[PDB]
């Protein structure tokens, strides 16, 4: 293992380092992860109103980045371009999706096209960190220890303990949303119960069960299949998460998006592969090999030829020069 994983997938949902999901429609900034005795860094997530905007990394006292789904990154208040490499934080793009690596400090954040924060974090912070993605221990039930230190049964007042205000905006306690689903029930639970159910029935998902349990994943979807009107696609966010959560455990799955009728969004020219190498052979590249022994990562990439050049796939014959 030697690593961890958090995920803020879909709308308002969360997945801690230890198999514990919940929902949280925040209103302001909140602490994702970071030390608790002494903080060398702190990953932070800004919510506008329930829906998320930005991931932020405050590197102690002196440095700050604010990337958004947007992607218009900035350092302090000055908007910078991208890529960017200051202070040991390489702010790159991998597989058409944005990354923020901090290997000196022990973390790898990223965001996808739809907007799904992810935090891979080292084993150095085992029983150390505490935040909105919980502590990195083995157990999964105790990982709501508030900023005071209090095992709370509620997954909601917990996340509101880990709020962090600024001078531009001071923020209050968000309220849990009043569900309109409770009256507009109708047929929406009968015909659409299956897209949640196919995590358990279909054979391509029928083999991570000795590694994980889909019972929370099917539990968290059934409450969000009810607000969207007229769509089977409303299940694939909670399903897409289940793919990665099994991949991180050491058992990857293949071709599950072929028949699922939902592919994650990516820009033109590329679509979602599974287990593409991060060292994408691009056009203006040096033909060197066997240094990129990194692990295999999911994300969208170009066709077999069609090398990359400035965020678009272009045929290898038309590789330009630079001066």
């Amino acid at each position: 293992s030697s690593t961890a994983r958090c995920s803020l997938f879909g709308s308002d949902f969360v997945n801690t380092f230890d198999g514990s999901m919940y929902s949280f429609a925040g209103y302001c900034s909140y602490l994702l992860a970071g030390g608790c005795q002494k903080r060398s860094f702190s990953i932070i997530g800004d919510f506008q109103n329930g829906k998320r905007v930005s991931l932020s990394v405050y590197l102690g006292e002196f440095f700050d980045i604010h990337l958004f789904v947007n992607g218009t990154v900035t350092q302090g208040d000055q908007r910078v371009s991208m890529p960017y490499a200051s202070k040991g934080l390489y702010l790159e793009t991998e597989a058409g999706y944005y990354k923020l690596s901090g290997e000196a400090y022990g973390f790898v954040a990223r965001i996808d096209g739809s907007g799904n924060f992810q935090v891979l974090l080292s084993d150095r912070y085992f029983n150390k960190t505490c935040g909105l993605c919980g502590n990195f221990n083995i157990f999964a039930e105790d990982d709501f220890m508030t900023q005071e230190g209090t095992l709370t049964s509620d997954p909601y007042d917990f996340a509101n303990s880990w709020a962090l205000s600024s001078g531009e905006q001071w923020c209050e306690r968000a309220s849990p949303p009043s569900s309109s689903c409770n009256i507009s029930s109708g047929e929406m639970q009968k015909g659409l119960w299956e897209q949640c159910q196919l995590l358990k029935s279909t054979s391509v998902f029928a083999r991570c069960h000795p590694l994980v349990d889909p019972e929370p994943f099917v539990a968290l979807c059934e409450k969000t299949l009810c607000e969207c009107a007229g769509g089977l696609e409303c299940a694939c966010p909670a399903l897409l998460e289940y793919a990665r959560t099994c991949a991180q455990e050491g058992m990857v799955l293949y071709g599950w998006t072929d028949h699922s009728a939902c592919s994650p969004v990516c820009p033109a020219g590329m679509e979602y592969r599974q287990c593409v190498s991060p060292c994408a052979r691009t056009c203006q590249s040096l033909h060197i090999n066997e240094m990129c022994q990194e692990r295999c990562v999911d994300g969208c990439s170009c066709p077999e030829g069609q090398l990359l050049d400035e965020g678009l796939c272009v045929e290898s014959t038309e590789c330009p020069c630079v001066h």
Binding site: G60, E61, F62, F63
Partner: protein
């Protein structure tokens, strides 16, 4: 339910007495002398009146320990704080009343630690009275002064000059060495111990000076004075908030107006009231650098100093670190940082906590050049953590009054049967010392003093230059 243990008995709130001081006012050893609030008792089980709780054990007698630094001490056990012993009896710590020997300092370029203990900031560029005795209604024996040049902003600039005026003398020091411009009358009390990194320097029964050859000035006074002095170090009275009594006899609140009262030249430039801020000039709007300096000054709170941090507060000596090495543009010599930590380690040494904080990648301090003048490399010169400053030598064979227990620096160590002399850098057998013993008695190695001024008829003088067993004839007054 649970029938409580035998050693104690359950209580019940009576319906009549409002003073139901039962379970809520559980008297432990901390809160016995302290007075407690109480609304009503509870359904608890409390110890008898003749005993108290003690860490999940109702200790019977009123013998329970006497805490200090959050540590246990049985009755009869002693603690040594300063030059006093102190024993606990009636649960309260019973000390002595031997006032100890105070110590000024100049921690860095522009700071001053008074006798009673008051760090303050005073960047000056004129000459200033560090401490003296001619204060109000006194004779005026000694007038230690201090003088800085280019030292309002700490840097590789700011060499200090020190002119000390005792017994009608003028001995002064700068640029590493000490110089006598006017020798003083009673040479007997004079003494100079160039041991290690320091220049220890006695001047009398109740006065001593220390100098790290670079900036520090740590004058040590004895119990004799007790409110007879004044200057930038204050009055030495125990009261810690009257060390800003200016020359015009009033307490001030802003130290930058204080030291301006103590300048000698009343027509040089008085220093400027700086706008207060947590960031000095270089660290001003350079928040990146301000963290690299803060972290490196946390060596004062590190695994190697944990023993001393419980005795000596590091928060004074940290504020100096951040202040100096921001302003200091350290380029070749990282001395404006390595000297503020050594000033903390030495204070930790005086309280008996020797420390080895100095490595090869941090403030190295080699000692190999003294083992060079001889072609054969004997290798006796070593950098010791904290070795005694007051040893025996060919020049100072007798033991001296030793204000400083131990000191850092390069120390010569060689097997016994050999004694150190400084001119010939190595250690040498005792007989090679120019030692003097005229007419039998033990004394120093031929001090250049004219003994016996008192009686003319008993004027039996016997000098000794280096070795001679001679005696000189007195010139008669008649």
């Amino acid at each position: 339910s649970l029938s409580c243990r035998p050693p104690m008995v359950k209580l019940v709130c009576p319906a009549d007495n409002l003073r139901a001081e039962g379970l809520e006012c559980t008297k432990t050893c901390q809160n016995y002398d302290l007075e407690c609030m109480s609304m009503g008792c509870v359904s608890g089980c409390l110890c008898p009146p003749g005993m108290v709780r003690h860490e999940n054990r109702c200790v019977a007698l009123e013998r329970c320990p006497c805490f200090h630094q959050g540590k246990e001490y049985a009755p009869g056990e002693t603690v040594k704080i300063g030059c006093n012993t102190c024993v606990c009896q009636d649960r309260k710590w019973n000390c002595t009343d031997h006032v100890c020997d105070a110590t000024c300092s100049t921690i860095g370029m522009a700071h001053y630690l008074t006798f009673d203990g008051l760090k303050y900031l005073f960047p000056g560029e004129c000459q200033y009275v560090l401490v003296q005795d001619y204060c109000g209604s006194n004779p005026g024996t000694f007038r230690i002064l201090v003088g800085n040049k280019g030292c309002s902003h700490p840097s590789v600039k700011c060499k200090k000059r020190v002119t000390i005026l005792v017994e009608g003398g003028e001995i002064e020091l700068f640029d590493g060495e000490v110089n006598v411009k006017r020798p003083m009358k009673d040479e007997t009390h004079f003494e100079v111990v160039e041991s290690g990194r320091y220049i220890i320097l006695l001047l009398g029964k109740a006065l001593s000076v220390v100098w790290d050859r670079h900036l520090s000035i740590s004058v040590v006074l004895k119990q004799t004075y007790q409110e007879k002095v004044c200057g930038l170090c204050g009055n030495f009275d125990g009261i810690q908030n009257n060390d800003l009594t200016s020359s015009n006899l009033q307490v001030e609140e802003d130290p930058v107006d204080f030291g301006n009262s103590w300048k000698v030249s009343s027509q040089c430039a008085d220093t400027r009231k700086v706008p207060l801020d947590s960031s000095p000039a270089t660290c001003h709007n350079n928040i990146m650098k301000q963290t690299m300096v803060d972290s490196s000054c946390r060596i004062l709170t590190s695994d190697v100093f944990q023993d001393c941090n419980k005795l000596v507060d590091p928060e004074p000596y940290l504020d100096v670190c951040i202040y100096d090495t921001c302003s200091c543009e350290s380029i070749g010599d990282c001395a404006c940082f390595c000297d503020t930590i050594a000033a903390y380690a030495h204070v930790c040494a005086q309280h008996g906590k020797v420390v080895t904080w100095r490595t090869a990648t941090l403030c190295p301090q080699s000692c190999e050049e003294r083992n060079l003048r001889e072609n054969g490399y004997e290798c006796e010169w070593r950098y010791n953590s904290c070795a005694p400053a007051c040893q025996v030598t060919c020049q100072h064979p007798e033991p001296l009054a030793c204000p400083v227990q131990c000191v850092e620096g390069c120390h010569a160590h060689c097997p016994p049967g050999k004694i150190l002399d400084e001119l010939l850098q190595t250690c040498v057998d005792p007989e090679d010392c120019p030692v003097c013993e005229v007419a039998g008695r033990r004394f120093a190695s031929g001090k250049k003093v004219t003994l016996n001024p008192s009686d003319p008829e008993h004027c039996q003088i016997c000098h000794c230059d280096v070795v001679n067993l001679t005696c000189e004839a007195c010139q008669e007054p008649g």
